[PDB]
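dumping the sequnces here before i forget
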Amino acid sequence: FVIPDFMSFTSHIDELYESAKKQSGGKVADYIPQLAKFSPDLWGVSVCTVDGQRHSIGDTKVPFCLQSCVKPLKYAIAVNDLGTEYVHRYVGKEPSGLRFNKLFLNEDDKPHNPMVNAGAIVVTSLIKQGVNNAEKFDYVMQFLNKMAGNEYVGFSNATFQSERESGDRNFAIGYYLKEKKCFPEGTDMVGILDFYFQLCSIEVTCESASVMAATLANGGFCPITGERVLSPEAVRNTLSLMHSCGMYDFSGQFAFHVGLPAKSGVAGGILLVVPNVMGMMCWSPPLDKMGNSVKGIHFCHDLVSLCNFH
Amino acid sequence: VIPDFMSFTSHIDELYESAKKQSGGKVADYIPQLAKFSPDLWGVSVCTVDGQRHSIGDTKVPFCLQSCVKPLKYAIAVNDLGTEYVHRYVGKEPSGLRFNKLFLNEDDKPHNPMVNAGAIVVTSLIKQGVNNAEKFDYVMQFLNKMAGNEYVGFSNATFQSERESGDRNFAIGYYLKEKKCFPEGTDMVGILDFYFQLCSIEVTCESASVMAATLANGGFCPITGERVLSPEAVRNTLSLMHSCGMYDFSGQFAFHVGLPAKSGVAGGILLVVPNVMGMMCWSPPLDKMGNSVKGIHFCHDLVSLCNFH
Amino acid sequence: FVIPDFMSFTSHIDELYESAKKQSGGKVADYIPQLAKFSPDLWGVSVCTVDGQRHSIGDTKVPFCLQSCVKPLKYAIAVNDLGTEYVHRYVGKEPSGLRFNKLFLNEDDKPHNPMVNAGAIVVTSLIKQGVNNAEKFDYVMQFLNKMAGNEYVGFSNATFQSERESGDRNFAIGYYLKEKKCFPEGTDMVGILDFYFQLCSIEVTCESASVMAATLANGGFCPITGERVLSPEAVRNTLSLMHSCGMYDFSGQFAFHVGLPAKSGVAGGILLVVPNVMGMMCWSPPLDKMGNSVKGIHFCHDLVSLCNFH
Amino acid sequence: FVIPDFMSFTSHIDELYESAKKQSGGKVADYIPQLAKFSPDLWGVSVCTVDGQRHSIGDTKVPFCLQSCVKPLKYAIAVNDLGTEYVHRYVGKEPSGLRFNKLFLNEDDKPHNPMVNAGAIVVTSLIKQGVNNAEKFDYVMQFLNKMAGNEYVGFSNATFQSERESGDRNFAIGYYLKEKKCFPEGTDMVGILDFYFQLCSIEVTCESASVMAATLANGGFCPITGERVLSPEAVRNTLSLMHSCGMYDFSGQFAFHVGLPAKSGVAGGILLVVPNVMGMMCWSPPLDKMGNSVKGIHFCHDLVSLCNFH
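..and the predicted 3d for all of it:
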């Protein structure tokens, strides 16, 4: 009952879709063939409110991997499993002010936030200590399936292989973290990076990602099934981190124009959450210079200019 | 707004006693005019957007708006000129370092209007081409309109000490001048003098609470009802305060309180609850990082008790 | 004598001069009109051996300001007056590794070396404490006249006026040093900066600068007059500093190719010292991208390639 | 003979040795037991002139590993085999001004100098591209045997095993270099790091290291055998690099006090070269805060205070 029209709202959504469809685009990957095979013409939007209302426009049935949209999810899982005090004992909560792949730590020799690469690696290490990687992956997959309301969540072996054979910057970051002793006692760095690469290669559709964001919007209760999947503290911390450093150094400027918790991925996916209202996923393979889809950014700006929100 | 300014005032009056039982740290000691206030001073003022007021403690002792004037001067500049002209010279993103760091962003511009360089540049943008007397008169009239004709004054004793001890500010000003970060036809020394004058404007907790309430209301003074600021100006000011209001601590603050708050070196915390109220907390004691211990404790207790956030 | 013949050597120097004259050049000043009015065709070389032997080629009678070639001389004056332990109580003796006009101090909150701008400002603050600028300038000028063997040393007021109204970076450095308590007790920063600007404006010809370089190479004894002007410790420390960080971030590369104590100024001047052998001055307004005279650098490279020295 | 008496010189050497023997010492390793098993009382000095004159006092027949004293040797080998213009195409020649194990490159995305860890890794990569590690090790060992005049040069398997499983900072540096494509085409980073660890574990005696330094002092001609082992350009570049950044950030300060090309290892070894005169090795397990032997530094300071040298 939060938006009891879903007729003019969807009309405006389609209008914004058509308006943003006119954008040319940009380079997508230019470094690997796995992400360079997607044609730039693909562009889809999926909206899911906190009541179960759903609306998909464009091509929302084409699966794509969650490159950087899984960091809030893994952080929420870690917080729910362990607790805020324990999970923030190893990582910070302030924005670094530099690029996401820079090799440096704060004054406490800890990663600045769970959104940067080092913070993501540490948070991945924190999950299910002293267990085989297969069990960790099964646990994360079942958690994602429960969070998405039993929608389509799958694995992309080719993408995982490409990342594991191309991502040596993450290996440098992991070795640097191991040297500074930022990991919990009794962990294997190579296995941690393998699990991180496996997590980054999980693929979803636009509707499934919209439901996943709507779960965070609702406050840990799935809008479809109604089952409690996350504690309120985990959702609150995830939203705070996404609002603070969701888009890295650009994030603050984003908060100046859109002012919503959103996360951007390499695969051209923008996952945004309007708290107590709804969640959206916008997929557009073409990317701009700083690693964000031009169509997704244009759609978000047009939406925040149209409706009040913010 | 609050149909319980009776029991709500009781909650405020119990958080006041909860935060009073603290020892804390130092006061300031950088200028003699601020290392004089007794550590036991502790006051809270609250003004809702509907005009209801409530104060408890030492809310009638004037104190300088050392670093709490940056949001107000930024709002004045944006209202006078506009968002696109104001941000043509300063950025809108956090720097990730201390407020007095001598470095610019990738575009050779100050990172945000909250650091010292950004504050100086924004000060350079107010009432261009006029002498300092008229600039100060304009700013004081704007502040009087902002506070609903409450107590706003000037502390010359603080201004003289601050003016002769701002070596870092002079270095920042010369660095900005060398990098061509100022509008054409500006005297840097006069800009720094006007900055020192602005930092020395003193208010009580009542007037600061009214200013926070009028920021919460959207440019409309809760008491008088006169529109003083444009919606764009107050929206941008709130966004900047939420993003980088507490400098490198800001994110952590947003992790716990999640409200737009600004902290001064005179032990003042000006916090805004949008569409709800505006509050001012004064406690001259400061911790190791530069915030009042009593004010921070009060903010944490308030956000733990009431939902807000 | 150091050069038993001094006839073949003069022919070699002349042919090196002719070879270096063929260079085109670059920009000259671009920041002040006093140093930007010099025509690129000016190119002169002066040589003075430690035994008094002299040789001048080209237009060496045109005065020019000692912009940044006065730092070794002022450091030598300060060390001779005060002592190594007192002088280095305020400045370091190690290269910074960054640009010369960078605003940062070492781990001890002191200037890295007396060759960067901050170190030079501190050093000129250390000279003749407790006296007004007139007597300071008189003392420095008498010391320079003693160093040059009563050759031509003068003051360029137009250059001084141009500099004192355009040194914003120097003012920022001075205020930064004042804040960090890097100055001796009882000093006026503005007066120190004015004295620094006055010192940078002292002008000489190639002959006087060659005599100064020969005095440094001789161990404090002026080759012409034969009277001591500097203590051995002062000249040794000055030579060590010039070899270590004489050319700022390029210095090491210079030591990789030439391996001699050389100091470069923004007025197209190269002061070269061959210890126990001679001292040379090369003047060419044409400057390169990094702030060195193209003709002077070419002459130094060709000279070190031809003769052994070192 | 460059030293005609060689009787008073040895007497002064013994006096300096006795004077330095009174130093207390400091922590040696405190992180591994392999380097912590050496008793602090060990202290030896060996001197070899360019005429084949040898003199050693102390425990000069106790083998110890060449930890950081092998970087000049490997750089000289690479320059002699390949050429200066090709060797410096991948590494710089300027001091970085920071710690020796910092993860950053210069403005050209190259290691600052061959003395830092990244420069050493790249230099090791430059040697014998596309060849098995056994052949590379045999070539390096035979080159060291020829340079040392067929003295004792051996391998320490325990040290190599301990280093290859503890130095993750080197792995981080190698992965960072591989990300920036600082390596030559067709190289394996893991094999390069294994070869680097093997090279760092080569052990010698004080007498053999003294002969090794005297070979560089003589100018590529072994003082004992008389056979040409290195080109003059290689030894000149090695001496220039050692003088510029032999002791990393402290190096400049060293040049202010001692002013000689010296290299210091973490195994408590100082290898110093007096050009055209002699070469010395000083071994002392006791180490100071910045990673240098206290007895070695004190001996170098006393030696430079007693004789002129420089």
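Chains D and B do not touch (no CB pair under 8 Å).
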